[PDB]
Amino acid sequence: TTLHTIQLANPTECCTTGPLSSDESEHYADLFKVLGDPVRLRILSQLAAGGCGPVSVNELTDLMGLSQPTISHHLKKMTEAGFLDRVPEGRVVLHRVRPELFAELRTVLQIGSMELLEHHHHHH
């Protein structure tokens, strides 16, 4: 049996490896460039507000009030970078958020003491 609790952990030490290398810096820069576009971030808001369910371009055009060609231009940039997966079988193509790169970028930005939850697993 396990009793689960979620509690507050004490703050971490500020910035709990060394400085990023030339290539690792070039890579994350490239990713931040992709999210550096207000349209792209707005796209992301709407994927997020739908619970990260898959969506079609016509659904995103309805959610955003921008044209299909606009939303497509930006979905390709986002898929190419790796923030979204394209599920192309069928009559209507879906796009799905991928969590992986968002987590890597969170790590890059772990500057300062963090306030985290702690999940205690009480096995008994």
Q: Considering beta carbons, is residue 68 or 110 the nearer one to ligand [As]? A: 110
For position 91 contacting a copy of itself by CB under 8 A, the verdict is no
Answer for which of 67, 69, 92, 119 binds a copy of itself (CB under 8 A) is: 119
> How far, rounded to the nearest angstrom, does the alpha carbon of residue 97 sit from its chain's CA centroid?
7
Q: Is 60 helix (H, G, I), strand (E, B) or coil?
A: helix
Q: End-to-end alpha-carbon separation of the chain, Å?
A: 5
Nearer to a copy of itself, 32 or 92 (CB): 32
The tokens for 105 are: 């970028």
Taking CB under 8 A as the rule, does residue 81 contact a copy of itself? no
Task: Using CB under 6 A, list all residues that contact ligand [As].
Answer: 14-15, 48, 51-52, 112
